[PDB]
Design a protein around this ligand. Structure first.
Ligand SMILES: Cc1cc2nc3c(=O)[nH]c(=O)nc-3n(C[C@@H](O)[C@H](O)[C@@H](O)COP(=O)(O)O)c2cc1C
Ligand SMILES: Cc1cc2nc3c(=O)[nH]c(=O)nc-3n(C[C@@H](O)[C@H](O)[C@@H](O)COP(=O)(O)O)c2cc1C
Ligand SMILES: Cc1cc2nc3c(=O)[nH]c(=O)nc-3n(C[C@@H](O)[C@H](O)[C@@H](O)COP(=O)(O)O)c2cc1C
Ligand SMILES: Cc1cc2nc3c(=O)[nH]c(=O)nc-3n(C[C@@H](O)[C@H](O)[C@@H](O)COP(=O)(O)O)c2cc1C
Ligand SMILES: CCCCCCCCCCC1=C(O)C(=O)NC1=O
Ligand SMILES: CCCCCCCCCCC1=C(O)C(=O)NC1=O
Ligand SMILES: CCCCCCCCCCC1=C(O)C(=O)NC1=O
Ligand SMILES: CCCCCCCCCCC1=C(O)C(=O)NC1=O
Lengths: 344, 344, 344, 344
């Protein structure tokens, strides 16, 4: 009946969404071992609270890529949001701007960069999927710059491969591809370029001046390469545990990637973040911020824009209370010594 | 039917107390992970008994802050005991004096320092909650000194935030605040000063000469600060796992805090102590004594003063037998090598 | 109904095979602790995928003992296959040749080396069980060379000791012993020579020029002896967990044996391999290839030659996808750093 | 119906024995955590079998305190065996002599040293419980020497404290105390001397020349003291997990005690030994032999002398097979490297 926390939206969404759709949303890869881990691993990290600290004034605002935001909790890119709620990306963009945070727009969105940008003022990032036809990629990137998007998140952990048993609602299209020259179900399928390599990151930088974030890094080895090749940030991710099963939980991999980057570029994380305590734990391990994926689609399905705003609020309030109880007045005061990781 | 051990009082109390009251007593924070840990962790520590030792005469008396007591098991402060049994703090004070041990009186007690002190001779400590109005704090402290209390336990792990669904029995008031100039349900709520810091420990020492114990320390870092700021003792505590979930069990945190204090001041522990074996394990890890919270309210609800005395006796007899079986004739002979901690 | 993966053949085989036969096939030793481990241990090893790698062209062909094969997945020797399907070894030999891989022929086969060799062109290994009468051993070895077998796998982890309650189908005989001069149920029983030692490996090399692989090694100590005595390869095996219970899973023992061999001879593994991910993990740990036992008999019982070919295909496709997702284009690119073992 | 292994006798004994008696036999202390551990810990130790070893001739005979016996498996002292079977100690003595092994006679036996010695030739040890009246102790020791007992096992882990609800069968008495000058239920109770110390071990050596084994050692510290005070052997024991709960499993404590003794005196073990694999594991860890307690009373209750002989045989055959499968032809060849302990 009443939603006291983020995970509850999942039950409500499950009630109102067709089984096929809910299963598609919640699903991980294969055995779904990592899906569970992305969540479970946060509970193997304990707090080491500090006492006798004046926690009367808590400040959780931060600067991401130069942009000042209200909290280190942002929205990850989840494709075709209008399938969860007719408002779709419009609802999400408005909730994000209202909350004073960042929203990342998927390439497979049901609303174009300009439709989203029309909703109003707000900092947004554009998620890029590189197609074989570079011509289409260039068109998408310039279009994002024009629409006012602040950075490009290049997804590199794209899962491979229901579809034949489902029929999409009418008029739902991949709007970002409407206008640029290339059912819509297919075609876009074998369009993802699996030959993508670091040289392509170099090329991307020649067509745009926007910061390029590499989304899908879980090893210290690739983190170094990200820095060496000029990426502006790294997003420790395993695509919500939908790409390959038995890879570690992103929160387990975070520290090694943060270490490897050596403070050169900000490291972000997604995968399993549901509570304010999870946010604190990620920041204590070195992350500059976190992205949430699934909670966004579940709350959108549940209460639309109101649901998305509630998720962000609940997470903010929980994160604020966690800081007060741990003895932290600002993000700068959250230290690695404020938690005791499973390997500590 | 028959109570052979402390944990059984819980079942009996659960039978006779209103659900809301029992749940409030037994409850931990959030998932209650730490609530369980405070208990479970004691079972991950094994004994390493010594043989061929004359265990004919066992001595468990000790000196706490100069005061000689019969056993290293004392009573922690639990608010408004008259709600568990009409006798409340009177019963507790009398059982404690009879057992030759120490009782800590809560600030939120249903009996004033002088009501408790009227019960008779006995060593008692007063637990202080610092309100924003320092004037009230000073009044409470002087009043405790006058009533003969031997030390002040400053609680620093005070949980934040049923209340709207419960009605209190008639005449039950926070007696310690009756007379000093400041329903009673509210007001006292937003009175706790969350700006409390070490400078406030320094100030406390200017208004009283009584030993100040810092209650709510679980890190080596704050333990050092306790010593550096003149605290007379440290109580490793997590407020019965009611402040923040996912902090370690106090028995897991004990050794690091004992190490950090470097023998300068005595370190005590509360949270999950129910058996004589638990007491032994805490002492072997360096604690100078332990405090019990919940068992006190459960037995009080069950058999009143008789229940509280029985708890103390059962714990004493179990602790005595554990010493005899481990090869220890005095507390001084209980060594770190007498147990094998989970990390050993 | 539909077989999407190898383990499913087991359910189908279980449905159509007599209980005694299925139980005999699936069974491990004693408590069957190792039987489970051979499988479970593969799940305690995580992947560490690399991104931005051109995985457009995957190559999994390899060279085993000089012979070029299509994939590092081969067939282990399982006795009397005609009991699982009338085609028996004929089906298996044909599926193996078709798949471009190697098949190892059991000494207790229901088809002779020449019957198997008659099926067509293909690389096959012959598994040798050393009988007390060396005369019979020599006869078997020369016969295998003549029939075109490429190497001898000397089994050394032969289990000791249903038989009295089962009756075999008519005409099923140990064909390899038909013709050479020595019911058939017995006799062959107490024929296995338990005095077999390294000196016997030296003797074997005097009667044949074929590579001798030592099958049944799980310690670094015996691996060294294998190399020192001239074995051409080692097969880390525990006889499908049927010899002795509580020995480690072969995947747990692999690395130590690979280390000990110091790259002198190839190390192979069998026991619990069912998925393409298992293959990858074994190769990352140093194995030059893997053998599958039980899946062969289960699929043979299920769909005969078609079942065996399907198993090999499913494993190939899963292995190929695992390489693409991990960032590996050839077997040479699969590194120890591509996984995170339970002890890492 | 049929007993294939030792643990099965327990079910049969449970069927025919009164509940109170069976519960008394099987019971551990308190939570019975250690009772389970004594058994469970053996399963956390893996085998590391060696191959290509001539295991045609296995030899498990050994020399204990100069006496040559057929196997390293002996009988621990369990009080009043006639309560399990009318034959009691007579059955046990005869089965032990027949098996060519050693039997330890309890002080609380229902048959005297001379009754047991009358059964025939066999090596037996006498278990001593030291009473406060040294006069009685001296009488018992000389009587044991006279009866031909080869060593004294001084029990030091004697549990403290059903009795009031049970009535003993007629004529069952503590025969060893019949004749020496001191219902029989009581008296013997508060007769155990809890002031027993190492000086008492020194005194024991002045009244007898028989080897003194110290029974009840689980720490390296007391093992050293055993050696320093002239004990002839150590028995790593926790009294079948009946003295104090949460002490480690004897198999977990064995290695540290073996190390500490530095090969000066033989170390033996009891507690949880049920299988031939358990025996091997104990020997690999350094024990010179093992004692079995409970299996003796359970099989005695089940089939009397025939049951006891069967237990010893089953254990012998299992132990022999374990040696053959591990590559060991003599006890001298069983090495620490033949197993992989949980901490390895
Ligand atoms: C249904 C669904 C759709 C997704 N669509 C995209 C997408 O369009 N683009 C992208 O890069 N990632 C996509 N992701 C994954 C990421 O946005 C992100 O890593 C996220 O799901 C993180 O995990 P969480 O869902 O546990 O928060 C999708 C994930 C899900 C669950
Ligand atoms: C119902 C209840 C009331 C409590 N009231 C107080 C209080 O008045 N003052 C204080 O400092 N702590 C209070 N505590 C906590 C401590 O006294 C103490 O840390 C204790 O509960 C330790 O854990 P145990 O209950 O497991 O023994 C309370 C705890 C409970 C369970
Ligand atoms: C029913 C059955 C029969 C077997 N027969 C033989 C055999 O004839 N020769 C041999 O060396 N090993 C034999 N093995 C064992 C090996 O081929 C091999 O190690 C294998 O079973 C590996 O494990 P997996 O079954 O988990 O793949 C047999 C195993 C089973 C399950
Ligand atoms: C019912 C019972 C009676 C026992 N009586 C004695 C006894 O008379 N003397 C002694 O030293 N120990 C006695 N023990 C314990 C030892 O003999 C011995 O340590 C043994 O039980 C070892 O464990 P197991 O029973 O798991 O083999 C007794 C144990 C049991 C179970
Ligand atoms: C049964 C519902 C129909 C499926 C809806 C089509 C969604 C298109 C794929 C979106 C997407 C994912 O699901 C993902 O993990 N990444 C993506 O880039
Ligand atoms: C439903 C029963 C009504 C609740 C009774 C009011 C008790 C007041 C709070 C006492 C208190 C706690 O409960 C605690 O953890 N610390 C405290 O200082
Ligand atoms: C109940 C079915 C009858 C049993 C069939 C006889 C198979 C002969 C043994 C084959 C064999 C095994 O089973 C094994 O682990 N190794 C072998 O070398
Ligand atoms: C309910 C059955 C009655 C009990 C029988 C009396 C046995 C006397 C105690 C024997 C004994 C034990 O049980 C033990 O652990 N050590 C001993 O020395």
């Amino acid at each position: 009946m009443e939603i006291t926390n983020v995970n509850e939206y999942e039950a409500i969404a499950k009630q109102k969404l067709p089984k096929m759709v809910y299963d598609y949303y919640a699903s991980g890869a294969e055995d779904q071992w990592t899906l569970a881990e992305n969540r479970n691993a946060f509970s193997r990290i304990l707090f080491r609270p500090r006492i006798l600290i004046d926690v009367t004034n808590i400040d959780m605002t931060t600067t991401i890529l130069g942009f000042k935001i209200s909290m280190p909790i942002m929205i990850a890119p989840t494709a075709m949001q209008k399938m969860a709620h007719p408002e779709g990306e419009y609802a999400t963009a408005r909730a994000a701007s209202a909350a004073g945070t960042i929203m990342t727009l998927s390439s497979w969105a049901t609303s174009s960069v300009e439709e989203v940008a029309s909703t109003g003022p707000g900092i947004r990032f554009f998620q890029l999927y590189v197609y074989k036809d570079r011509n289409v990629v260039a068109q998408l990137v310039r279009r994002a710059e024009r629409a006012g998007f602040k950075a490009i998140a290049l997804t590199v952990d794209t899962p491979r491969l229901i579809k034949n048993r489902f029929v999409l609602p009418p008029f739902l299209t991949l709007k970002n591809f409407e206008g640029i020259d290339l059912g819509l179900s297919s075609y876009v399928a074998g369009q993802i370029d699996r030959s993508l390599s670091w040289k392509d990151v170099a090329w991307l930088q020649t067509i745009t001046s926007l910061p390029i974030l590499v989304k899908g890094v879980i090893t210290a080895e690739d983190a170094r390469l990200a820095v060496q090749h000029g990426a502006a940030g790294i997003i420790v991710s395993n695509h919500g545990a939908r790409q390959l099963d038995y890879v570690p939980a992103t929160i387990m991999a975070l520290e090694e990637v943060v270490k490897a980057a050596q403070g050169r570029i900000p490291v972000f994380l997604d995968g399993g973040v549901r509570r304010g305590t999870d946010v604190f734990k990620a920041l204590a391990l070195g992350a500059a911020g976190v992205f949430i994926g699934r909670p966004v689609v579940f709350s959108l399905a549940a209460e639309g824009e109101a649901g998305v705003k509630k998720v962000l609020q609940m997470m903010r309030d929980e994160f604020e209370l966690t800081m007060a109880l741990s003895g932290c007045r600002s993000l700068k005061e959250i230290s690695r010594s404020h938690i005791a990781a499973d390997w500590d």
